[PDB]
Amino acid sequence: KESYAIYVYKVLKQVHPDTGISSKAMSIMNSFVNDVFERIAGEASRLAHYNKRSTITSREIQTAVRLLLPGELAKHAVSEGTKAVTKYTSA
Amino acid sequence: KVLRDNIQGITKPAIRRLARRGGVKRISGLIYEETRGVLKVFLENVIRDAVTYTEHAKRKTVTAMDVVYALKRQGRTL
Amino acid sequence: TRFSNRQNKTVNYN
Amino acid sequence: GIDIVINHRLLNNCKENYEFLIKWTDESHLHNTWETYESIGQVRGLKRLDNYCKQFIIEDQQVRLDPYVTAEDIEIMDMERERRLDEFEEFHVPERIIDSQRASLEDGTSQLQYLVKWRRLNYDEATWENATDIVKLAPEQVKHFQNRENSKILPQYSSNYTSQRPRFEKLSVQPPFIKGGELRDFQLTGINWMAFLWSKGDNGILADEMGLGKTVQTVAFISWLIFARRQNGPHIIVVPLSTMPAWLDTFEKWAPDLNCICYMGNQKSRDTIREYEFYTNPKTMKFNVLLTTYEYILKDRAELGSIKWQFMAVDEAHRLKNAESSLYESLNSFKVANRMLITGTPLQNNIKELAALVNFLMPGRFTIDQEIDFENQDEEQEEYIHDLHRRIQPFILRRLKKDVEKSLPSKTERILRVELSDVQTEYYKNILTKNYSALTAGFSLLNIMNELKKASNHPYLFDNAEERVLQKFGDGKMTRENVLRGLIMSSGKMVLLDQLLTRLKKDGHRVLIFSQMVRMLDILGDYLSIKGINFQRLDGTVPSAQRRISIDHFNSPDSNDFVFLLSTRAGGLGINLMTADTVVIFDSDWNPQADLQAMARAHRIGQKNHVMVYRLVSKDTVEEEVLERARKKMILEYAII
Amino acid sequence: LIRKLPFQRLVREIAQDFKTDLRFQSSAVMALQEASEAYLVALFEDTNLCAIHAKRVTIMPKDIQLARRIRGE
Amino acid sequence: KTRSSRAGLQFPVGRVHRLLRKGNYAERVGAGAPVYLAAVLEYLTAEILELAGNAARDNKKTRIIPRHLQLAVRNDEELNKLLGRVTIAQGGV
DNA sequence: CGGGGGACAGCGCGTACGTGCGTTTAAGCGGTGCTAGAGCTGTCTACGACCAATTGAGCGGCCTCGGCACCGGGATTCTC
DNA sequence: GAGAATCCCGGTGCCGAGGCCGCTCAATTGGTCGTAGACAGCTCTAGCACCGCTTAAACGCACGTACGCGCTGTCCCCCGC
Ligand SMILES: Nc1ncnc2c1ncn2[C@@H]1O[C@H](COP(=O)(O)OP(=O)(O)O)[C@@H](O)[C@H]1O
Ligand code: BEF
Ligand SMILES: [Mg+2]
């Protein structure tokens, strides 16, 4: 129920609208999405606790993703996050 | 009807097919009994924890989600 | 349209 | 290539001295010849001769060297010999020619070969063989082939009828198309009412009682509509496997001149049938009628669904219980001008099944829905079930022998309440009590009802029970008689039925045994054999030919095998056992109608004498509750009538 | 690749050892098949690497024991 | 406009912002964090889906299927080494 | 730097593994039939959270004594 | 058999461990408030067992060869000083 398949469909149409997806693949994407989410969140939490912080911010996640993620994917994703939050905050 | 399936169910041709998928060229005739043992151990490891998950739910039935929990942590370590 | 930032090896999957 | 020998005649002595009635991989059964090991030499498939050599060795060992083999076991060996050799001789007689072609020979001459199918045998064997033998062995078959080549009963000869339906009304004349016997008023009125229903345009149900003529009636009606209604386009008859030969035999006696086929067998068989039997100039399809089983529909769902069917007919139509059945799906992926559903009882269990049937006849046309449903008593449901009754009544035909033909003698039916053995009491308690140690001594509790029910019929359904019983007897293991006793004592029903069987043995009575449980029918098979009884078994495992010939022999009046043992799921349906006066049921199913069907297997047009029926009921065990629920289901039948 | 009926009967046997009374979703059995196949294939690829390192075409049980020790233990 | 559309993002910032509380990860969460999270989630899935789309397209299939995902995942060493312990159901070797 | 041992390559022989063939066997699929437990909903009571006060223990610092390590000498044990 | 390496025994130094004392903070005790969990009941469905039927897969045997193992000889390198 609390699932991303509609968002998967959005980005699927946004990335390869010529491709359908099996419900199996869609579920795998949902499992994948949940896995990466809990991975980054669990890390950022434990980093915040290590920093004695009761709050999580962009820096914590920006640090955590650079920890989790391969070097290119990291700086690309980091730039995407900073761009996005810049647009969000500038709005 | 004397044989028991748990060993026999995993059988020379299927093992051969797994080996071919694993790219193996040729196999000693001894290998199969090692792999059955290893398989039992591997299976034994996961299912015990699935049982305990099912215990904590106090349910009689075991779901794929319990399997996913046991298989998740155990698979990453192994 | 969801453009990809990384420059990566081209693959044939056929 | 080598093909496996019909017979043998005169270990190194066995290899050198003897001679064998070979067959070859590309030559029909009539090409059998006597050949010898050195004369053939090494040839592809010689391991078959090795297999037959081993067989012949063990035959010599069993027939000649083993001193224990009893005279009746030698007689059973002689039966196996002569019966198989006669069936090989039947393979040596053609049954069908499929087509003719002239072909060049290596001498530069040419010969006219007929594609010949063979008796008891199918289009895997069938092959082009020179007509020179066909014309002398079966000129009747040549005549029939020349008819079947030329009937002009084919899809291209009939239109899309649905736009128009002329009336019909009841008639009182014997069908002139029919060679196979003599309809009475009830069969004819079957024909009449089906024709009237067709003439409203409709699809219908036949539920005059089980064994009352439907097969002959339905072939007579299909003949009438082919001839009368020009229904030359294909008709599909779907049939339970065991009865497919009888349906064929019906045609082969009642309208033998029709061009109709049965569709079965391996992909090769079905392919050769499609291309040679169906296709003309591959398409248009040579046959007027195809018999199939349910699963052979799924085997060619879209392929056969490509035909514009003019008529669907359905034996044991309760095989179609619900819309979601893969069969029900496939049959509604098919399109047809008419549908006719045949079953001597129209519903097994519940209103939803009948709703699915009537939707299959006339989808959505009947306002039958859960919103009014079978509360055990309710004025609203009882009103609506009488409203549905009157709505359907133009669309159902139903009668009993009580109506149809008082000449047919009635059935005695009785329950035989019987006590548990000590073994039974122990095991049943050990299901009521949860004793994992008792399970470990002989192992699942995950269906307690099934465990206790099968125990309640027999504790030997737990394999360690036979050991621990015969060891606590101690002598039980030691001899055939001690085994026989230690077995038969272990269930009170077995003791009672052994007494009754001994009485019938003195009577000379002929009897049918039925059970739900194949392992119990195995234990009983072993009991019969150690008791020296002459009998046949039937269950869903025996393939077509052996089961057919078993039925034929048992229906043969000289059959010394006075007992037939049957499964319910396979054996309880479709078949007539007119040589049997008596029927016994070890255990009723949840569904009563299945029991009525089993009764019908005895109870038939062909039954000469008043039948007797007995149900083995254990005292104070759940089957009484099963029986009451089955009776409630029968109350639903009594409500719809 | 591996046969669901034998496989699940084995699975139920082992479960029966721990609990002695179970029910299973068919999805659970499927997941166990997928896991076991993947694990076994990986171990085969390892043991083949061992066999070729020993310059054999045949894999040997020694190669299984070694691979399982080095990776698994 | 909605926080996602304000960021241009195609994911439920409200859900994940809620989930950051619902998972106890911290008793406080700062407004950019769920936004920044959503941005990287979108980026990550896009990279894999692009490769998987090529895999389906190369296999002449419109349907993306576990095989096509698995082929993509194993072909990028970074994704593969990132996902080295992820196992794909019905994803062949 | 020198010497010895291990590594490598090639050859022969036998056995095991692979392939083919035929027959047997159980899986795969569909249907039968039912019951158990799964899940959901509603209600009530217990348990923890929060706040405040009080008391005792733990933590931190200091001092004293004993244990461990290192060094030297002699005898034992292994190795060529 | 002889020499080199290893072990055991005794003394001394040096520091760390263990104990004591006092203070501060945490833990404990008690009361209040609410919500989460537990308990009970109902309805739905999915899970379990068995039969029917087809067909493919698996098993067993025989035949052939190829691969593995062991032996032998040469050469290089690494180990030891
Ligand atoms: N018109 C008839 N005349 C004589 N015998 C008949 C007739 N119709 C049926 N029978 C007998 O009934 C038997 C067939 O039973 P059948 O009625 O075909 O079963 P069902 O119709 O219930 O499927 C045949 O052996 C045949 O002898
Ligand atoms: F179908 Be009949 F009742 F044999
Ligand atoms: Mg019939």
mmCIF file of N, CA, C and O (backbone and C1' of nucleotides) in Angstrom, chain G residues 1-7, chain H residues 76-80:
data_model
loop_
_atom_site.group_PDB
_atom_site.id
_atom_site.type_symbol
_atom_site.label_atom_id
_atom_site.label_comp_id
_atom_site.label_asym_id
_atom_site.label_seq_id
_atom_site.Cartn_x
_atom_site.Cartn_y
_atom_site.Cartn_z
ATOM 1 P P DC G 1 79.160 -12.263 -4.941
ATOM 2 O "O5'" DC G 1 79.615 -13.724 -4.492
ATOM 3 C "C5'" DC G 1 80.078 -13.992 -3.155
ATOM 4 C "C4'" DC G 1 79.481 -15.278 -2.633
ATOM 5 C "C3'" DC G 1 79.195 -16.360 -3.679
ATOM 6 O "O3'" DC G 1 79.728 -17.601 -3.208
ATOM 7 C "C1'" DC G 1 77.325 -16.041 -2.274
ATOM 8 P P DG G 2 80.478 -18.587 -4.215
ATOM 9 O "O5'" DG G 2 80.337 -20.006 -3.502
ATOM 10 C "C5'" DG G 2 80.122 -20.105 -2.083
ATOM 11 C "C4'" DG G 2 78.973 -21.037 -1.772
ATOM 12 C "C3'" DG G 2 78.739 -22.173 -2.772
ATOM 13 O "O3'" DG G 2 78.501 -23.360 -2.007
ATOM 14 C "C1'" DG G 2 76.723 -21.031 -2.366
ATOM 15 P P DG G 3 79.080 -24.770 -2.488
ATOM 16 O "O5'" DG G 3 78.154 -25.819 -1.724
ATOM 17 C "C5'" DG G 3 77.494 -25.476 -0.489
ATOM 18 C "C4'" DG G 3 76.003 -25.702 -0.594
ATOM 19 C "C3'" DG G 3 75.569 -26.925 -1.410
ATOM 20 O "O3'" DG G 3 74.611 -27.657 -0.638
ATOM 21 C "C1'" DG G 3 74.305 -25.036 -2.019
ATOM 22 P P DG G 4 74.620 -29.256 -0.644
ATOM 23 O "O5'" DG G 4 73.216 -29.624 0.014
ATOM 24 C "C5'" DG G 4 72.505 -28.685 0.842
ATOM 25 C "C4'" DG G 4 71.131 -28.401 0.277
ATOM 26 C "C3'" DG G 4 70.390 -29.607 -0.311
ATOM 27 O "O3'" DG G 4 69.043 -29.575 0.172
ATOM 28 C "C1'" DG G 4 70.346 -27.813 -1.828
ATOM 29 P P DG G 5 68.288 -30.931 0.546
ATOM 30 O "O5'" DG G 5 66.780 -30.459 0.744
ATOM 31 C "C5'" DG G 5 66.455 -29.083 1.016
ATOM 32 C "C4'" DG G 5 65.516 -28.539 -0.035
ATOM 33 C "C3'" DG G 5 64.456 -29.518 -0.549
ATOM 34 O "O3'" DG G 5 63.211 -28.815 -0.637
ATOM 35 C "C1'" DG G 5 65.590 -28.545 -2.360
ATOM 36 P P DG G 6 61.832 -29.557 -0.306
ATOM 37 O "O5'" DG G 6 60.734 -28.553 -0.875
ATOM 38 C "C5'" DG G 6 61.011 -27.149 -1.043
ATOM 39 C "C4'" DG G 6 60.789 -26.728 -2.478
ATOM 40 C "C3'" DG G 6 59.565 -27.334 -3.171
ATOM 41 O "O3'" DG G 6 58.995 -26.324 -4.006
ATOM 42 C "C1'" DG G 6 61.461 -27.682 -4.489
ATOM 43 P P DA G 7 57.412 -26.184 -4.153
ATOM 44 O "O5'" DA G 7 57.236 -25.505 -5.582
ATOM 45 C "C5'" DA G 7 58.178 -24.527 -6.062
ATOM 46 C "C4'" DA G 7 58.534 -24.819 -7.499
ATOM 47 C "C3'" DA G 7 57.369 -25.328 -8.350
ATOM 48 O "O3'" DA G 7 57.381 -24.631 -9.595
ATOM 49 C "C1'" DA G 7 59.226 -26.744 -8.596
ATOM 50 P P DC H 76 67.945 -22.248 -15.184
ATOM 51 O "O5'" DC H 76 67.045 -21.191 -14.405
ATOM 52 C "C5'" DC H 76 65.668 -21.496 -14.109
ATOM 53 C "C4'" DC H 76 65.393 -21.390 -12.626
ATOM 54 C "C3'" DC H 76 66.022 -20.185 -11.919
ATOM 55 O "O3'" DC H 76 65.048 -19.638 -11.028
ATOM 56 C "C1'" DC H 76 66.514 -22.143 -10.727
ATOM 57 P P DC H 77 64.791 -18.058 -10.955
ATOM 58 O "O5'" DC H 77 64.180 -17.886 -9.498
ATOM 59 C "C5'" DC H 77 63.428 -18.956 -8.895
ATOM 60 C "C4'" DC H 77 63.828 -19.150 -7.450
ATOM 61 C "C3'" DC H 77 64.283 -17.885 -6.719
ATOM 62 O "O3'" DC H 77 63.832 -17.921 -5.359
ATOM 63 C "C1'" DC H 77 65.932 -19.522 -6.524
ATOM 64 P P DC H 78 62.341 -17.455 -4.977
ATOM 65 O "O5'" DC H 78 62.292 -17.670 -3.403
ATOM 66 C "C5'" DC H 78 62.322 -19.000 -2.867
ATOM 67 C "C4'" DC H 78 63.462 -19.137 -1.884
ATOM 68 C "C3'" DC H 78 63.726 -17.897 -1.030
ATOM 69 O "O3'" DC H 78 63.982 -18.342 0.299
ATOM 70 C "C1'" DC H 78 65.718 -18.692 -1.899
ATOM 71 P P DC H 79 62.809 -18.387 1.367
ATOM 72 O "O5'" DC H 79 63.383 -19.399 2.456
ATOM 73 C "C5'" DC H 79 64.012 -20.638 2.056
ATOM 74 C "C4'" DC H 79 65.430 -20.717 2.577
ATOM 75 C "C3'" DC H 79 65.718 -19.896 3.837
ATOM 76 O "O3'" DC H 79 66.453 -20.726 4.736
ATOM 77 C "C1'" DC H 79 67.373 -19.496 2.223
ATOM 78 P P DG H 80 66.267 -20.583 6.323
ATOM 79 O "O5'" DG H 80 67.757 -20.740 6.861
ATOM 80 C "C5'" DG H 80 68.672 -21.683 6.268
ATOM 81 C "C4'" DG H 80 70.058 -21.084 6.198
ATOM 82 C "C3'" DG H 80 70.437 -20.177 7.375
ATOM 83 O "O3'" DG H 80 71.746 -20.506 7.852
ATOM 84 C "C1'" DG H 80 70.879 -19.090 5.348
#
